[PDB]
DNA sequence: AAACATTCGTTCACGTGAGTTCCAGTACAAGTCTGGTC
């Protein structure tokens, strides 16, 4: 039940962010994914266990996709 | 001088390419039903 955390449970809630759509009266929804990913590193400094940024890896072949799936 | 062969413009039938209407296959999106736990 991440849907409803229990107080006695040892595990806690974590937020893995993979997009930003607005920062300081600047609308990022019409921008490219590259620029939003770049901006996402200038909003918060992640602290493991509570808030994090999902890692994206560059790839330009099908074999890379298959290796990641495996 | 008379008979037969050849040629010519005409005619019909049959075949092939391009335009138009109708329907089947495909794609995508939304709706509906179901499963599991906490």
Swiss-Prot record:
Where along the chain is ATP bound? 18
Source species, domain of life: Eukaryota
Compartment(s) of residence: Nucleus
Regarding tissue, the record states: Testis, thymus, prostate and heart.
- Chain's role: DNA ligase involved in DNA non-homologous end joining (NHEJ); required for double-strand break (DSB) repair and V(D)J recombination. Catalyzes the NHEJ ligation step of the broken DNA during DSB repair by resealing the DNA breaks after the gap filling is completed. Joins single-strand breaks in a double-stranded polydeoxynucleotide in an ATP-dependent reaction. LIG4 is mechanistically flexible: it can ligate nicks as well as compatible DNA overhangs alone, while in the presence of XRCC4, it can ligate ends with 2-nucleotides (nt) microhomology and 1-nt gaps.
Tell me which disease this protein is linked to: LIG4 syndrome: Characterized by immunodeficiency and developmental and growth delay. Patients display unusual facial features, microcephaly, growth and/or developmental delay, pancytopenia, and various skin abnormalities.
Could you say which protein family the record assigns here?
Belongs to the ATP-dependent DNA ligase family.
Assembly information from the UniProt record? Interacts with XRCC4; the LIG4-XRCC4 subcomplex has a 1:2 stoichiometry and XRCC4 is required for LIG4 stability. Component of the core long-range non-homologous end joining (NHEJ) complex (also named DNA-PK complex) composed of PRKDC, LIG4, XRCC4, XRCC6/Ku70, XRCC5/Ku86 and NHEJ1/XLF. Additional component of the NHEJ complex includes PAXX. Following autophosphorylation, PRKDC dissociates from DNA, leading to formation of the short-range NHEJ complex, composed of LIG4, XRCC4, XRCC6/Ku70, XRCC5/Ku86 and NHEJ1/XLF. Interacts with DCLRE1C; the interaction is direct. Interacts with APLF.
The name this protein carries in UniProt is DNA ligase 4
Q: Which organism encodes this protein?
A: Homo sapiens
